[PDB]
Write a protein that binds this ligand. Structure first.
Ligand SMILES: N[C@@H](CCC(=O)OP(=O)(O)O)C(=O)O
Ligand SMILES: N[C@@H](CCC(=O)OP(=O)(O)O)C(=O)O
Ligand SMILES: O=C1CC[C@@H](C(=O)O)N1
Ligand SMILES: O=C1CC[C@@H](C(=O)O)N1
Ligand SMILES: [Mg+2]
Lengths: 325, 323
């Protein structure tokens, strides 16, 4: 009976479409979560609003149009944001815990497992995790970049049964991607209006509300779900045949099919695979250092030993360490 | 004339040696900072106490002695902690900004500079950065591992003139003073319970122990290397150890004896002597497999061995910090 639900609240949900966090709207969504919590369910919050909270608290100041500006606002806003969640949940006797992360914290199976553990330890002790991107401390390069996608990753981390993406009803687009990442990991996804009375309870019960996305009948293997989180450390461009081999046959990537290789990356790191078109067709763990791949690109499997002076098997990226599409 | 001070407050300072954060002791220290802030000075806080705040807030629950327990405590505790710093600084009309980080945020020049700019943007706008390790989201492998060392890095990031390590009155404190002192930052170790200690340190009044900034500091372009977590290691000749330590020379592949791990060109690595001691960290010019392949060989052979070449040196003196 007990279930794990991730609720994602983006900025216009939190502000009610104004330039200020709306505590009336938020406390009403907290009340709904509390009700499910009191009933034995596990609740995870993914929250936006750090920058809006900061802008408000500093009195809307003139700032250089720079990333430093946004990060300074998030440093201030995130302080205020977590307070707001803490105070509001405390009305209902519920404790919260702050987690701030980026793709960097999922560049490994190990760092992914670490984040998973923290989050499950929170839920196991009846604390609600309040998750957001670590905006104050991050380069654009390591960020998830939108909270829709982040909440899917959080759903995976939490071993969630459902993901609820609240809307204030491009914005639709990240939501569809999130629904896709989540469903493939075996998690039901619902897009629904934050302003709909009893929305969160309805979703939890199974009452048709918002837009339903069924979890994949047979989900992507648990052991490789962490690859969804990793930021690709470089990109590999690949054959017409290799492309087909990966998308149709679900096969591994042979260096025979590699056309080019961009970036510096090591064996063990996750990289992006592109077709000649330029489209991202897969992410997967590299078996070879990047200087070694440029070297064995185009050559058959039996040749690797002799080109490099060593081998780490015949495959550039193994299907078991790969996520297509 | 206006200055930049980093104040580090560990757990026993914030609790006054009990298991609860002491709001009385803390507001007094905040008052001292605020007085310096109002006079034009730039104040940065490096705070411990997330775990202690967490246990108290949860009512001292019985938790498994695991790292996930510590991480849950930090997740709850950091939240309480940032709230306490904000509430108290606001007494004085001062805003705070939360920054949580690990060595990962300093594994790179770019990520290092990104944090630098954020911390300095906070200060230019009179906001006090409240800095801590990201204990809720981090593996052991990527943490600084102690807030003494963390504050030395924070001082570097901030372009601090002084670092003040507050005590409940040691080795991690001496380590942090070394890092700061080398980066040209005066480090003071002194008792947090000393009346006017923060204000006194700013005025240069003798309180506790002062460690002087290095007469000629480590070059600024390479200070970020104190921050990085080594991505792998190299073990090195008796000859190469001596060239590095005694004559500050670059590292040539000839003296490389072994290579540990998987890493790329551009990543910081650790250099070990044969006895196993850490003697320098420096940016690798070659990937780890390439290094295994050219270890013990002359620079002339690199191109012929690898099929390419990035200069005669495995780790340049310019991208290296010894010790
Ligand atoms: N951290 C994100 C913003 C958060 C976010 O995207 O929230 P949403 O777009 O789901 O309202 C960024 O890249 O600035
Ligand atoms: N929070 C950090 C460091 C805390 C710390 O050691 O500071 P201390 O209380 O020793 O001055 C951690 O990773 O344990
Ligand atoms: O749109 C926004 C407001 C705050 C920031 C965040 O991710 O918290 N993004
Ligand atoms: O000793 C402690 C208290 C909490 C944690 C921290 O430094 O935040 N370490
Ligand atoms: Mg201390």
């Amino acid at each position: 009976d007990s279930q794990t639900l991730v609720v994602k609240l983006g900025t216009s949900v939190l502000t009610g479409g104004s330039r200020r966090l709306n505590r009336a709207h938020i406390v009403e969504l907290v009340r709904q979560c509390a009700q499910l919590h009191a009933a034995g369910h596990r609740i995870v919050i993914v929250t936006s609003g750090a920058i809006a909270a900061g802008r408000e608290h500093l009195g809307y100041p003139e700032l250089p149009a720079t990333i430093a500006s946004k990060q300074l606002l998030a440093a201030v806003g995130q302080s205020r944001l977590i307070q707001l969640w803490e105070q509001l949940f405390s009305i209902y006797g519920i404790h919260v815990g702050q987690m701030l992360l980026t793709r960097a914290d999922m560049e490994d199976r190990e760092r992914f497992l670490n984040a998973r553990d923290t989050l499950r330890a929170l839920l196991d002790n009846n604390v609600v995790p309040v998750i957001n991107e670590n905006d104050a401390v991050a380069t654009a390069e390591i960020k998830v970049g939108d909270n829709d996608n982040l909440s899917a990753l959080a759903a995976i981390l939490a071993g969630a049964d459902k993901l609820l993406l609240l809307t204030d009803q491009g914005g639709m687009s990240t939501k569809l991607q999130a629904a896709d990442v989540a469903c493939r990991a075996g998690i039901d996804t619902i897009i629904a209006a934050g302003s709909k009375p009893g929305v969160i309870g309805d979703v939890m019960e199974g009452i048709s509300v918002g837009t339903l996305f069924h979890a994949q009948a047979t989900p992507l293997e648990n052991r490789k779900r962490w690859i969804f989180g990793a930021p690709p450390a470089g990109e590999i461009t690949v054959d017409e045949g290799a492309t087909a081999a990966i998308l149709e046959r679900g096969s591994s990537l042979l260096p025979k099919g590699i056309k080019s290789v961009t970036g510096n990356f090591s064996r063990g790191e996750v990289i992006r695979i592109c077709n000649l078109e330029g489209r991202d067709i897969a992410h997967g763990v590299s078996r070879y250092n990047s200087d070694a791949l440029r070297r064995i690109a185009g050559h058959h499997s039996q040749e690797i030993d002799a080109i490099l002076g060593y081998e780490y098997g015949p495959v550039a990226v193994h299907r078991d360490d790969m996520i297509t599409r």
